[PDB]
Amino acid sequence: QAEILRAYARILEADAKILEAHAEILKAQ
Amino acid sequence: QAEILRAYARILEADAKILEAHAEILKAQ
Amino acid sequence: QAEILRAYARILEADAKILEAHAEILKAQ
Amino acid sequence: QAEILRAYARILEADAKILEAHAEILKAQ
Amino acid sequence: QAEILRAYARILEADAKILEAHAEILKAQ
Amino acid sequence: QAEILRAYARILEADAKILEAHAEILKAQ
Amino acid sequence: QAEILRAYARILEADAKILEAHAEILKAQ
Amino acid sequence: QAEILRAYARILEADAKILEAHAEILKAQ
Amino acid sequence: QAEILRAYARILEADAKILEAHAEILKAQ
Amino acid sequence: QAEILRAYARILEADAKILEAHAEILKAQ
Amino acid sequence: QAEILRAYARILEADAKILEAHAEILKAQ
Amino acid sequence: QAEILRAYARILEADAKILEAHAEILKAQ
Amino acid sequence: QAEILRAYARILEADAKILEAHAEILKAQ
Amino acid sequence: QAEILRAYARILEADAKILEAHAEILKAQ
Amino acid sequence: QAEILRAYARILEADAKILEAHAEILKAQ
Amino acid sequence: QAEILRAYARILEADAKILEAHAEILKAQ
Amino acid sequence: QAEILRAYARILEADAKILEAHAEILKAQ
Amino acid sequence: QAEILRAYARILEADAKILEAHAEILKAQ
Amino acid sequence: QAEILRAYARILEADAKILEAHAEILKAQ
Amino acid sequence: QAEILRAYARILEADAKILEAHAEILKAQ
Amino acid sequence: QAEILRAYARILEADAKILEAHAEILKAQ
Amino acid sequence: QAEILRAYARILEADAKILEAHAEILKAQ
Amino acid sequence: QAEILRAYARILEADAKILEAHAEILKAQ
Amino acid sequence: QAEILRAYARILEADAKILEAHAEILKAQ
Amino acid sequence: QAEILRAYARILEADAKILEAHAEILKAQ
Amino acid sequence: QAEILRAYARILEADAKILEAHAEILKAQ
Amino acid sequence: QAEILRAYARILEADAKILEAHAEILKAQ
Amino acid sequence: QAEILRAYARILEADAKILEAHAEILKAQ
Amino acid sequence: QAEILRAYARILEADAKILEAHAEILKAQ
Amino acid sequence: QAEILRAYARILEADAKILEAHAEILKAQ
Amino acid sequence: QAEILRAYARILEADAKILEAHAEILKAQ
Amino acid sequence: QAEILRAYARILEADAKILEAHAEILKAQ
Amino acid sequence: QAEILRAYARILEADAKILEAHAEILKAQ
Amino acid sequence: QAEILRAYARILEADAKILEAHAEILKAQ
Amino acid sequence: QAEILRAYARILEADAKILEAHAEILKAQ
Amino acid sequence: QAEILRAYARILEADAKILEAHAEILKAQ
Amino acid sequence: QAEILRAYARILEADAKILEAHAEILKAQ
Amino acid sequence: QAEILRAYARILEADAKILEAHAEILKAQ
Amino acid sequence: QAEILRAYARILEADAKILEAHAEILKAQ
Amino acid sequence: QAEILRAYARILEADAKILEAHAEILKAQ
């Protein structure tokens, strides 16, 4: 496992912080 | 499990946070 | 279970959050 | 149960939120 | 592993810290 | 490794400290 | 190595202290 | 080396102590 | 060297002691 | 050297004491 | 008489906050 | 008499908020 | 009688804070 | 009776802090 | 009776501090 | 009765300090 | 019973100091 | 019983001093 | 039993002084 | 068993003095 | 001329803020 | 002439804000 | 004349802050 | 003249902070 | 005159600090 | 005058420090 | 007068340090 | 009267040093 | 009276030195 | 009277040195 | 493309926001 | 490009923000 | 560029920030 | 540049910070 | 430069810092 | 300079530190 | 200078230190 | 100077030390 | 001086040492 | 001085030593 399926959320949460910052590099570009 | 089926929500919640950010890179593109 | 049958709502609530965002990527596409 | 019959409302409420967004993806199709 | 898949969360965490800083150089450039 | 894959985080953390300082030189330039 | 890849952090940490001081000379310049 | 690559940190640390002092001479100049 | 490359630190440490004292003659000047 | 480059540190070590005391005679001047 | 009957308004105001909260539990039940 | 009659209006104003909430609880009855 | 009946308002205010929190638990349940 | 019934408000205030914390655990569960 | 019932608030206050901390462990789990 | 039930708060306070530290060990894990 | 249950707090206080240090060793690992 | 359990705190206090020092060897490693 | 378990604290106190020095030998290494 | 274990502390106390002196001659090396 | 008549606007703007508040005191009176 | 006529508009706009509030005081008269 | 009549605006602004607060004391009275 | 009428603004601003706090003493009363 | 009326602004300033604290004693009473 | 009325400000500030501390004793009571 | 009323400030400041410490004894009690 | 009331400040200052230490004995008790 | 009440300060100062040291025997106990 | 109470200050001054050293023989025990 | 035809919709969407604002400036012409 | 034609949307979007601001100046003029 | 045409968006964005600020000055003028 | 045209954005950014500050002076004027 | 045009930003930044500070003096005036 | 124009920023920076301090002297005035 | 214009910054820096000290005397006055 | 203008900084530096100490005689007054 | 104007700094430095001690004589008074 | 003005510093230096000694005998008085 129940944590094993729960652990991918912490993986996939970090995939947002790539992308929501990836707009910011275009924002003041 | 009742948590095992509940834990997929925490998976699927962050799946949205990809996509709403995935528009934001195309927003100020 | 009464919660077991209730728990699928928290699944299915987030199931919309893909799709209402999955148009927003198509919105400013 | 009286809540067991009441619990399906929370299921079927979110069943709409799929579909009313599922036309919004066809809006900017 | 359960930590092995959990360890990449610490890997990808700082990958955002590159990019949000990598806009800040473009900010006052 | 589990530490070997963990060790690159300490590497990649310091890559940010270049860049967030690399804006500060351009900040009061 | 595991230390060999770990040792570059101590190298790269000091690369910040060049640069964050390299703004301070331009600060009261 | 493992010390050979480690020893440059002690070299590069003192390079900061030039520059953070190099602001101080310009500070009360 | 491993000492030969290490020995320049003892040179470069005292190079700071010129400069941090070089502000002090300008301090109470 | 190895002492030859090390001996210059002892030369430059005293060069601070020329200067760090040079302020002191300017201090109560 | 002025504030004494005024005080029951603050009493009766909180009675409204029970009942909608006593209804809000019935909504997502 | 000006405020004494006016104070009951603040009393009866809260009496509405009971009853509509008392019927709002019948909506999700 | 001024504060004595005013005191139950502070009592009854926190009674609402139970129930909406007693509702929020069933929301993400 | 002024403070005696006032004290239960401080008792009942923390009961709300249980339940939303008893809710927040089920959120990221 | 004044402090005797006041003390349970100090008991029950820290009981909230368990549960949000009992939630934060599941967040980065 | 006054201090005897007061002391458990000091016991239960440190019980929270376990768990957030038990949480922080998973963060950099 | 006053100090006897008080002393366990001093025991349990140090148990927090283990774990954050047992976490800090994971941070720069 | 009072000091006999008090002494384990002094035992466990020094156990924290190992681990942060066991982390400090990792930092400049 | 009092001093006998107290004596290990004086043992374990000196165990910290190894390791922080065992780090300090790595710092100027 | 009183000083028999305390004597090792006097042994291990000087063991730290070796290592910092093993560090100090590495400092001005 | 141009600003002098604009100055009375900033006067007369705040002249309403009495009156719209001067009903609010009569509102919950 | 262009702004001078427009300046009275900013006057006469705020002349309404007296009066529409000046009936609101008659609302709870 | 420009600032002299402008100063009454700063006077009359705070005249409102009496009255909107003067209702708030009557609000929870 | 100009500062003298501005001085009462600093006076009359403080008259608000009496009164807006004067409700707060009735708020948790 | 100008400071003499400004002096009461410092006087009445702390008069609020009585009352907002004089509610905080009533807050957790 | 101007200091004499300023003197009560230093008096009346300390009256607050009684009361805001006078709540803290009742806070963790 | 001017010091005589100033002297009670030094009196009344110390009345706080009784009370803010008087909570701290009840804090870890 | 100037020093005679000033002398109690030196009296009352040390009254705090009892109590802030009086917590410290109960702190590690 | 000036020294006679001042003498108790030298009494009461050392009254603290009992108690702050009285924790120290409980500290490393 | 003036010295007679100062004499007890010298008495109680040494009473700390009994106790503050009493921990020291317990410290390295 | 299908996006190439979709992209001009984002172009022409902004073309509306020019003109209504370009006529909004004619409202306060 | 497809982004090249998308880029002018970000150009033309800011053109709207001029004109309403070029109108908002005309409003309070 | 594609960034070159994107670069004027950052130029033209700040051009709007002039004008609304160039309007806000005329508001409180 | 592309940075040359980007550089004027940093120039024109601070021009907005003049004018609202050039407005805020007229607000409390 | 490109720095020459960047340098005026550092000039014009502090020009904003005058005016808001030139406003704050008029606030508490 | 390029430093010559940078030098006035250090001049104009301290000009702001006058005025807020020139403001703070009116606050407690 | 270039130092000549830099030297006035050291002059004008101390001018700020007068005025806040010229305020702190007015604070506890 | 260039030193002649630098010398007045050392003059004016000590002028600050009067005034903050001039406040300290008022604080414990 | 150039020393003549520098010499008054040594005069004015000791002027501060009067006053802070002239405060310290008030503290334990 | 040039010594004539410098000699008063040696006069005024010992003048501080009177006053702190005038304070120190007041401390243990």
Numbering used by the authors:
A (entry chain g), B (entry chain k), C (entry chain o), D (entry chain s), E (entry chain D), F (entry chain c), ...: 1 to 29
From the paper:
Here we report seven high-resolution cryo-EM structures of filamentous peptide nanotubes based on a cross-α supramolecular architecture that provide insight into the designability of helical peptide filaments. A structural interaction is identified based on an appropriately placed pair of arginine residues (RxxxR) within the corresponding peptide sequences. In contrast to most structurally characterized filaments based on synthetic α-helical coiled-coils, the chain axes of the helical protomers are oriented in a plane nearly perpendicular to the long axis of the assembly.
Therefore, the designed series of Form I-like peptides encompassed minimal peptide sequences in which the structurally determinative distance between the RxxxR motif and the C-terminus was systematically varied over the range from 2 to 5 heptad repeats. Five protofilaments interacted to form the 15-10-3 filament, four interacted in the 29-24-3 filament, and three interacted in the 36-31-3 filament. The Form I/29-17-3 structure fits the observed trend, in that the 17 amino acid length of the structurally determinative segment lay between the 10 amino acid and 24 amino acid segment length of 15-10-3 and 29-24-3, respectively. Similarly, the 4-start helices of 29-17-3 and 29-24-3 and the 3-start helices of 36-31-3, passing through every fourth subunit and every third subunit, respectively, were associated with the axial stacking direction of the protofilaments within the corresponding assemblies. For the 29-24-3 peptide, the interaction occurred between the C-terminus of peptide (ia) and the RxxxR motif of peptide (ib + 1), in contrast to the C5-symmetric structure of 15-10-3 that involved helices ia and ib. The length and flexibility of the arginine side-chains enabled the conservation of the RxxxR lateral interaction between protofilaments despite differences in peptide length.
